[PDB]
Structure formats: C-alpha cells, structure tokens
Design a protein around this nucleic acid. Structure first.
Ligand SMILES: Nc1ncnc2c1ncn2[C@@H]1O[C@H](COP(=O)(O)OP(=O)(O)O)[C@@H](O)[C@H]1O
Ligand SMILES: Nc1ncnc2c1ncn2[C@@H]1O[C@H](COP(=O)(O)OP(=O)(O)O)[C@@H](O)[C@H]1O
Lengths: 155, 60, 441, 449
DNA sequence: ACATGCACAGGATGTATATATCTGACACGTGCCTGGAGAC
DNA sequence: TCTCCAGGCACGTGTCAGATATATACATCCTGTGCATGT
C-alpha cells in the first residue's frame, strides 16, 4: 500500500521526520475516500489521529476540534479541505500538509489559515505534495494563475 | 471506459486503491460447502457447521 | 464443454447387425472394414455371454488401418455396464511398485461385481424449520416439508438437528434426506421463494417442487471391480490409494481371500460377477517378463478377455535379442487368436473423409473431396484428416463459406506429409544431425 | 530488463490475410514456417482441437524455438502454454508417463467464479464448552464454543464445531484478535490486534489493523484461473479442511505421486458439472515439447493414448535430427527420432536455412535490441563470420566487442574491436582444429583422449 | 429562384467529488393511571 | 368483589434517507439558424 502511491510513499518519509521533530500536522484532502484509505495507513504506522469531513456532525465537529487542541497526543488531524467553515482554530498544529490541491487557491488558503492565525506561537510550515508529470502540476499552475489575477486586481 | 478524466487523473495520483483495491483473497476451493441462504434470517445466535465435502465422491 | 472433437469422436458403436452378424458397410461411423468387424462382433457377443475365460484376441495390421477404431467401437457398443479398461503398454513400467504386479492390477480392474440394494430417500421443499436452541442446544425441533402432493411434519433427533445446521437448510430448499445415513444433498432451490433468498447470485437457477410421494425406495445398482476391493482392504483408510496411485505391492493373501468371498457372495445369491474387457494397446512394448505372466493370468476363472493390437512385423522382443512375428514370443502366440486387417480402397477413403468432414461440420465441394481422396491415396488417412481441419481454418482466413481446391492446395503446401518429410531429411543430410556432423552453410 | 537470446521476437508478424511479410516484428524471412505457425495459432484459438500433432523440423540454428516464443506471445496471457524438454520427464519418483500426463493437464486451463463466505470480525468473548467424556483414554474434549465477533455495524455471537475450534487453536487467537473464518475449508487467519487495544509501548511487533467495516457476515465473489492439474494435485494430496488426513498431510514432505485414471476421469466430470452450471469456462492450450528426439519409445507409445482423449491439448514437437536411432529400441532408425508409426499424426512443418542477407538483418536487429550500435563495415564483418562459421556464433561476438569498444573510449563498434574479439573468443571449429593439430600425442602437454 | 440538408454558436445539459442544509417519520424515553389480571 | 401494578397512552425528542442547491472544472449534446448546392 504505502509504495503503490508515490504521494503516500513520500508522505511516509515526511511524517516520520515530522513526528520525530514533535510537530503536529493538519493534513488536508480533497477526497474523503482517500481520507479513508489513509485512516488505514495511519493505523499501520500507529499514529494518533482525528478526522473532520463533511460527514462529521456539528457538535461532533466541535468535540473533535476541541480534542486536537486540548490533548497533544494527537499527531495528525485528517481534514477535508472544503469542510468546516472559517472559524475553526487549530493553532496548536504547526504543520500543514496538502495531500492534494484544490483548483481554487482560496480554499487551500482558508485551509492554512486554520494554523496561521492569532494565538499561534510556532512557525507554520506548509507542505504540498505534487506528483510530477501528472494533472497535479496542471492544477498547481492553474491555481497560481488564479492567484495572479487576485494579486493584480485586488491590490 | 471512464467519464470525468480529470477526476480520474487525480484519483490515480492519490492512490490506485481508489480504483480497485485488493483484499485477503485465498486459493480456489474444489469441494462442496454449504451456502448461507440470506442475511436477514440468522440474526444473532447462529452455529457454524463443518460442511466441507469433496465433490469427488466414491460410492460403495 | 469437454467434448472436443478428437480423432475418434465419430464412432458410435461397432455398427454391425446384431441378428445375423452382418457388417453393413456404413453405420455408426465404422465404414469399410468387413471381415475384421464381423470377427470383432463374434468376440463382442461372446463377451456379453460370460461363459468363457480370459482369452486373447490380437488385432494385427498395418498402421492407420482402423485398429483403435475397432476397439473404440467395441467400447461404445457395451455402455457403462461391462467394464472396459484401456491400457497403453507403457503405464506398466512404474517406480511405485514392480512391473508384474502393475500388470496384475490391470487384470483385476476388469472383473466387476454388480450388487443391487435399496435405500429410502425423501424429496420435497422445506416449508419451514424450527429448532429449539434456547442456553439450550440441539434437542428438539420441527420440520415441515411438502411435495406437490404430500405435506408433512417430522420431529428430529439430536443427530439430525446437527445435520440440519450442518447443511444450513433454509425455508425453501429442495433437499434429499437419506434416512439410513443422514446426509443432505440440496438438489436446488424452489422458485416460489425467490424473494426469500438475498445471499445468492443475481443469476441463480431455481427448480420446481418435486412430483410424487415424499418417501420412496430406490434400487440403486453399484458395480466395483476386484481391484477396488483389494485397494480398500489394504490400509486403514486405503481407498484414497486408488485415487492417488500410492498403493504398493499388495500382498497376495488379500487377493486370495477376496477371490474366496466373491465366490461365497455368488453362491448366496447376494452378488453377480461381470467379466469385463481389457484392451492392451501396443502390446509389442512388453518384454518377455510380461508374457511369462500373461500366459498364466489367462488361466484362472477370474480373468477378463484381453484384446490387443500390434503394428510391428518381424521385430525383436524387448529384454531378449531374438526376433519374432508381431513382436511377441511364440509360446504366447499359441495362446492368442489373430484378426488381420487390410488397407483401404479409395472409395472407402472418400467416405471416411466424408464422415470426418461431417463430424467437424465442414462444408466441402466435391472437387476438393476428390483432391483430398487423391492426397489420402498417397499420404494416409491421418494426413488428410488433418488437412480437413486445416483447410476449414484457411477458408476462414479469407472469409469463405465452403472449402475448395485453393485451400486444400495451400494446406498441402504448408504442412508436409511424412513422405516428403523423409525426402527432405534425405536431401538435407549435411545440416540435420544424423549422428556426428553439423555443417553450417 | 535482461536481453536474453530471445528478446527481439515479439510475434509472428502476419498480415490480415494470414500472409507472412518478411522482416516484421522480430523475424527475418522464414515465410513458410510463419504462415503455418499462424494457422496453428488460429487452430488453438478456435477450440475444435482435441489433440493435433505439429512437428517443427529443421537443423540447429534455424529458429525452431523462436517460432515457439512467437506462438506463446501471439496466443496471449490467458491461454495456457507449457514448455518442457525431452530430458525433463525422466524422474525418480514416478514413471515418466505420469509426468507426460501432468504436463498435458498443465496445458488445459479453467476460469472459475467462486463465492467465498467470510466471517470477518473482532473476537470479543472466547469460551469453550466441553461435553461429556467418559473413560476412553484421551480424557476431556472441547466440543462447542461461543466466539463473539464484533464488526463495525452489528455484532454476532456464534457457535462452533470442534474442528473449527482446532483451526482457531492452531492460529493462537486470543481475545482482541481480528480474524476471518473462511467457511469453505474452515481455515481462519489471524490478522492482528484491534486498534481498540492499541499501545505504542509494545514488544510483540504485532500488526494493528482497525475494525473491519461492513457486515460481519460478508459474501464476496472472485475469479480464479485454475488448470486441471491443479485440481489433480488438490484431490490427490489433500491440504484443505480441518481433519487429520488434511493436517498431517501438510507436515510431511511433498512427493509427486501417480494420479491414476479414475481421478482424472472424475475431475473431468466435476469440471463438466461446473460448466453446466454456467460458472466455469474451459480454455485449452499448448504443450511445447522441445527436443522430442530425447524421448524414448516408451513415451511415443503413450502419446497415442494421451492424444486419443476427448480432451487433450495440441502438441508442438521440435526435433533437430536427421536419420537417427530412437532412444528406446536401438534397432530401428527413422527420421527425426520420431518412430514411423507416431510420425503420421504429425503435421510436419519444415524450416529452411538462411541467406547472407538475412544474416545481416538478424545481426542488425540483435544489435539494436541489445543496445550495441556499430558501423556497416563491422556489420559486414559479422555477417561474413555468420556465413562462414555459424548463425548463433556471430551474434555472440557483439557482447565482448561492445565492452572492448568501451575499453578504447569508443561508443560505436568498429572493425578493430571485432577483429580483436574474434581472436580472444573462439568458435568450436577452430578450437577442434587446434585440438587435433596441437594435441598430437598424449603426455605432459597433451590432451586426455 | 427556392427548398433542403448539413455544420457552426454558444448555450443547456451533463459527469464527478464532498460541502452546506433540511425535513419528517420513526424510534425511544418519560410519566402515570386505569383496567387487565389475581383468586376467593 | 377488593386489590394491585404494568401495559399502554400522551408527549417530547432527535436523527437520518432522500432531497434541496453547488463550488471546482470541463466535455458533451443540442438545435436555431445560415449558407451552399441541387433541382
Ligand atoms: N472403418 C473406419 N471407419 C471410420 N474411420 C476409420 C475406420 N478405420 C479407420 N478410421 C480412421 O482412421 C484413423 C486411424 O485408425 P487407427 O485405428 O487410429 O489407426 P491405428 O490402427 O494405426 O491406430 C482413425 O482416426 C479413424 O478415425
Ligand atoms: N528468423 C529469425 N529472426 C531472428 N533471429 C533468428 C531467426 N531464426 C533464428 N534466429 C536466432 O537463432 C538463435 C537460435 O535459434 P533457436 O530457435 O534457438 O535455434 P534452434 O532452432 O536450433 O533451437 C536465436 O537466438 C534467434 O535469435
């Protein structure tokens, strides 16, 4: 499993280093089916995690987010990128990773704002795993473009 | 053949098991077991029976 | 489905008349051979008589003159009643056991015992099952079944409820409770409860309810040879040996005691002995150590009739160095009685090719059939019978319907008959490895 | 990624009308053999075959087995192809006719759908319930259990036989181990500790898996590719079930045994019962017996009855012999080593030697296949060696001449590198000439004659 | 000169991933009291 | 007839199967209509 996906194989290396550093990760996905696959992987490598996606009921949301923030044993939070509005605070996490990018820049921007916010203390680092030679690079361009239009007009 | 190929592409890059995952298979079985009829009858307290016989029979 | 067209899938019996023993020239596949088929008819009618020992008939003749054809005709003209056993004579030279004993087992495989005894079975759709497992256990329960006619309730013993949860009998199964043992063979599923089956495939067969009474007696007839009983009475659970060949040298006192109990079964009327046929194909591949045992295994009361086929002329006997007719020693040729065959006239060649064409369902123009008969005059039956299957496919290359001269002349062009292959070897000596030399251009 | 002797062959290279076009898909020339091999391939893919004999004659070094790999890459992956030799069947456990029939039933395949019935749960309560056990020597005996499986949606509390309990017991299933009782045999593989008992302070190196989602009584269908010889071995030495013959039969050493006629007929009737239920599909194949002249007369006797069967794969024999003596009986000589009675079954395909330009094309294809580029004068030199010495000698003078080229800083192979490799590495003919000339007398500096 | 047939314009429809909302019917918990059950 | 209590009734509640739009992208089907060709 971990080698049949190039991203997953590279995420493994990165999570081992992050763990040994004592970093805490929000890890963002654009597909909840993948959220499931991963859920497995994390069980294998025996890391503690939470989950919040569009299936996660509202008071359960409150509960999970509060955990991640209360109890530092949890290393990864698996978050669906569009799920959860503005105003979930995860500033105990110091690392964000995007397993896959959105076509819309702002949705990834709003996602990393969950770490980078008032009351954050440590320096947030944002990984972005890109599969070279595939649609993922297309996406990344098309999104940097869009961000150029935002930069030109709303300045 | 698949419809939304940009969606299909992203799935591949994520993990091939999004498509067709494997799962503890097993070797082929030649004998004659007993198939369960339905799921909605034997509710909670059921008993398994060793029903394994060979299809090769020898009649004496 | 496992009925692929072989080189003898057109023979549906010996084809001769059974009233005046006349070999009518074209019936059931065997076409043309007359005197040999009448002699095989006489041998066949004295096999079903039973009042003769194990004798020996040698089907001698040239290659591809219909010897395995006559043997397969006698095999099809007996049904699954009298045990016919084929034996190509190189299955004897084994390493699990000796060689004379491997021959003895092939004699014992062709003497059947036919006994007929009754059982009591139950048909019918299960209407419902209630089992009083309440902590309780398999103690009591009710079984309601029906046919189209009957309907009944039975109460069950503990050693029947443990067979009902063993086969998992649903409400709607078509089961066969053998009453004397307790096994349950589900014959299928009833159609009328097609909604009540969720854990089945989308494509699933369904039967109807069984017709008639629900409690009937069957007169099944079993037939097992003496080698079956020998291998059964050889180990603890030894019948697996005759499915895995791991039987060894069976001691002879077991065979003697079983030869005694079969006679005691016959004299009490409990049994009946059926002498079978043993066909030793290619009998020239036996050494003299075999013939010095076949000369005495054809002496006892319990000996099947041996039919055997030889190709060789004056050839050597294996094991020894001196030559003999048919590859057989003369003290054994005193035992056998020889049927000689003949080569085939061209019209018989034409209608044998016609039968082989109608068997594979290949359309032929009569010009192509004339050309194919002309080829078979010069290259034998096997070459033309393969040119048929090749020419159908070559006609299917260029999308044709009937084969013609333009496809038989291609099959004759690509695939050499063995005479031109011998000419090819004789005219390409220096590159083909004769014994010593390899020359590379 | 290893260039073997047969790597450039990618198929027969036939047109739509079945006409062989030369220098296509690996081969060079060889028309009358490749058209006949295409006819053989479409004879295989039409299923009107129950034993046909196809002989591949021709001298050594003319590409008899190149046609065989062309056939095996033209049929496809899902058709059985069993290549053997003539020396492979002389065994020490069984008679060689058993090895012939085992290859004949390796060459017949079957594609079967199966419905496995797993019970995939997490063990909650494991409690044995022994029965009455009077004075009979062995003592008590566990006869009934109460194992509770707990999946994600709806638990179940089931009761077991003694044999499935022994299947559990030889797997060391504690409380917490997820398992998957297979109710076809009875086998049950422990997967690991459930993640509800997870602790990073652990030492057993267990594999923690989550609770299996879905119903605890699943039912899944798969497709399986099984040959008839696999069924023969399965019913011969049993290794499935939970009784004693099928458990003490997998601790012994495995031995090839003589699967008799009765098992080979009963498995045919079982497979016909599968086909009549609309489940299994039969796909016959090829037995390629290379070097058929090594088979002795006791094997060509048995091939007659092995091909008279209503189900028998097509045989493709290869034999690079002229008029030779059969191995079994040393007093009748025949063509190819095949006996003159067995030879009439065969549809004999000839194979002719090559030409001084076809050798040049084969050298060019082999050089661009291995990855050795070179000049045209060097190609002419290697073709000159190919005409004079042998075909598969001059192909082998490309692998040192690359390395020697890389010695001298070159990339392409020139005349000097082949002119040096023809002196370092010799053929058989000049070596035998040196042998006869120098080895005049036996002694200190002689050869053992 | 008129009619019919064949391809541009660019729009509406469509495919696929979870998100963000929602609604009403079913199931379950609570409280209580009267009438179904006891038995002489 | 004197006696008891639990089954059932009224009342909340809570949740989730099928349904309402959709950001994120793009290919595709559709057919009004214009132009060209043929009669
Ligand atoms: N009388 C016949 N009728 C039909 N086919 C025949 C007859 N005689 C021979 N054949 C055919 O000729 C072929 C050779 O017969 P066979 O007995 O196999 O030759 P051999 O005796 O050399 O084994 C067989 O395939 C069979 O189909
Ligand atoms: N038509 C051909 N095209 C290309 N290479 C060939 C051809 N025929 C033979 N060869 C070469 O000859 C070599 C040996 O052929 P092979 O089949 O082993 O000879 P044999 O027929 O003696 O077994 C192979 O490496 C193959 O590359």
């Amino acid at each position: 499993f971990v080698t049949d996906s190039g991203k997953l194989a590279k995420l493994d290396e990165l999570l081992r280093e992050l763990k040994e550093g004592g970093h805490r990760v929000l890890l963002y996905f654009q597909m909840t089916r993948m959220i499931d696959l991963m859920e497995e992987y994390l069980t294998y490598r025996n890391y503690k995690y939470c989950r919040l996606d569009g299936s996660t009921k509202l008071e359960d949301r409150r509960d999970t987010v509060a955990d991640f923030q209360t109890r530092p044993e949890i290393f990864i939070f698996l978050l669906s990128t569009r799920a959860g509005g503005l105003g979930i605070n995860l500033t105990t996490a110091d690392t964000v990773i995007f397993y896959d990018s959105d076509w819309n820049p702002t949705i990834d921007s709003q996602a990393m704002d969950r770490a980078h916010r008032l009351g954050q203390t440590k320096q947030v680092t944002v990984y972005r795993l890109i599969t070279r030679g595939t649609i993922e690079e297309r996406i990344r361009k098309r999104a940097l473009q869009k961000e150029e239009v935002q930069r030109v007009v709303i300045t | 053949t698949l419809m939304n190929l940009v969606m299909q592409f992203r799935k591949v890059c994520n993990h091939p098991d999004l498509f067709e995952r494997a799962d503890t298979s097993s070797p082929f079985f030649c004998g004659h077991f007993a198939e369960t009829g339905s799921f909605l009858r034997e509710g909670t307290n059921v008993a398994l029976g060793y029903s394994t016989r060979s299809l090769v029979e020898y009649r004496l | 489905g496992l009925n692929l067209i072989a080189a003898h899938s057109h023979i549906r019996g010996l084809g001769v008349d059974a009233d005046t023993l006349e070999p009518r020239p074209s019936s059931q596949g065997l076409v043309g051979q007359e005197k040999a088929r009448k002699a095989a008819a006489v041998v066949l009618e004295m096999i079903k008589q039973g009042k003769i020992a194990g004798r020996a008939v040698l089907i001698a003749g040239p290659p591809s003159t219909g010897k395995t054809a006559i043997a397969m005709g006698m095999a099809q003209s007996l049904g699954q009643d009298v045990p016919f056993t084929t034996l190509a004579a190189s299955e004897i030279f084994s390493l699990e056991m000796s060689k004379t004993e491997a021959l003895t087992q092939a004699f014992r495989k062709s003497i059947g015992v036919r006994i007929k005894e009754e059982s009591e079975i139950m048909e019918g759709e299960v209407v419902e099952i209630q089992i009083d497992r309440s902590t309780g256990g398999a103690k009591q329960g009710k079984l309601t079944i029906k046919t189209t006619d009957m309907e009944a309730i039975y109460d069950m013993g503990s050693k029947m409820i443990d067979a009902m949860t063993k086969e998992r009998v649903m409400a709607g199964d078509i089961i066969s409770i053998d009453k004397s043992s307790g096994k349950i063979t589900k014959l299928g599923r009833s159609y009328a409860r097609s909604r009540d089956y969720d854990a089945m495939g989308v494509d699933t067969k369904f039967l109807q309810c069984p017709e008639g009474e629900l409690q009937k007696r069957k007169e099944v007839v079993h037939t097992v040879s003496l080698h079956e009983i020998d291998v059964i009475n050889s180990r603890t659970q030894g019948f697996l040996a005759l499915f895995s060949g791991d039987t060894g040298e069976i001691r002879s006192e077991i065979r003697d005691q079983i030869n005694t109990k079969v006679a005691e079964w016959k004299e009490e009327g409990k049994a009946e002995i059926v002498p079978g046929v043993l066909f030793i194909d290619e009998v020239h591949m036996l050494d003299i150590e075999c013939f010095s045992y076949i000369n005495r295994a054809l002496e006892s009361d319990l000996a099947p009739i041996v039919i055997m086929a030889s190709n060789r002329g004056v050839s050597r006997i294996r094991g020894t160095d001196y030559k003999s007719p048919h590859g057989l020693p003369l003290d054994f040729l005193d035992r056998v009685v020889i049927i000689n065959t003949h080569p085939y006239t061209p019209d018989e060649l034409r209608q044998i090719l016609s039968i082989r064409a109608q068997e594979e369902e290949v359309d032929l123009t009569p010009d192509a059939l004339a050309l194919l008969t002309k080829i078979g005059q010069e290259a034998g039956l096997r070459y033309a019978s393969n040119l048929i299957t090749t020419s159908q496919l070559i006609a299917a290359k260029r999308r044709a319907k009937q084969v013609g001269v333009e496809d038989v002349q291609r099959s004759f062009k690509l695939f050499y008959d063995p005479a031109r292959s011998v000419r090819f070897v004789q005219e390409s000596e220096k590159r083909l490895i004769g014994n010593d030399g390899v020359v590379d251009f | 990624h290893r260039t073997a002797a047969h790597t450039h062959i990618k198929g027969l290279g036939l047109n739509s009308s079945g006409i062989a076009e030369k220098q296509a898909a690996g081969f060079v020339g060889q028309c009358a053999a490749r058209e006949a091999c295409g006819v053989v391939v479409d004879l295989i893919k039409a299923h009107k075959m129950a034993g046909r004999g196809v002989l591949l004659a021709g001298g050594p070094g003319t590409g008899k087995t190149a046609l065989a790999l062309a056939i095996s890459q033209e049929l496809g992956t899902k058709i059985p192809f069993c290549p053997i030799t003539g020396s492979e069947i002389y065994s020490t456990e069984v008679k060689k006719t058993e090895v012939l029939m085992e290859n004949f039933r390796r060459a017949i395949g079957l594609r079967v759908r199966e419905t496995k019935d797993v019970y995939e749960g997490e063990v909650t309560e494991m409690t044995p319930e022994e029965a009455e056990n009077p004075l009979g020597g062995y003592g008590k005996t566990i006869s009934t259990l109460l194992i509770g499986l707990k999946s994600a949606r709806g638990q179940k509390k089931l009761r077991l036989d003694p044999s499935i309990y022994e299947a559990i017991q030889k797997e060391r299933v504690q409380v917490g181990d997820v398992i998957y009782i297979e109710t076809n045999t009875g086998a049950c593989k422990r997967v690991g500790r459930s993640d509800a008992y997870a602790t990073e302070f652990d030492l057993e190196a267990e594999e923690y898996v989550p609770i299996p989602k879905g119903e605890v009584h699943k039912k899944k269908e798969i497709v399986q590719d099984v040959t008839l010889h696999d069924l023969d071995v399965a019913n011969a030495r049993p290794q499935g079930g939970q009784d004693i013959i099928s458990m003490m039969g997998q601790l012994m050493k495995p031995k090839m045994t003589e699967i008799t006629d009765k098992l080979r007929m009963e498995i045919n009737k079982v497979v016909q019962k599968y086909i009549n239920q609309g489940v299994a599909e039969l796909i016959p194949g090829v037995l390629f017996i290379d070097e058929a002249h090594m088979l002795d007369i006791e094997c060509f006797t048995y091939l007659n009855k092995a091909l008279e069967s209503p189900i028998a794969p097509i045989v493709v024999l290869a034999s690079n012999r002229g008029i030779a003596t059969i191995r079994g009986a040393d007093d009748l000589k025949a063509a190819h080593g095949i006996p003159p009675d067995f030879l009439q079954r065969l549809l004999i395909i000839p194979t002719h030697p090559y030409e001084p330009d076809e050798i040049r094309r084969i050298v060019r294809i082999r050089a661009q296949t291995e990855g050795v580029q070179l000049t045209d004068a060097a190609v002419d030199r290697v073709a000159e060696h190919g005409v004079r010495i042998s075909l598969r000698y001059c192909l082998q003078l490309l692998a040192p001449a690359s390395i020697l080229a890389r010695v001298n800083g070159r990339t392409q192979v020139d005349v000097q590198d082949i002119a040096e490799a023809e002196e370092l590495f010799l053929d058989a003919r000049r070596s035998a000439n040196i042998l006869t000339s120098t080895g005049e007398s036996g002694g200190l500096h002689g050869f053992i004659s």
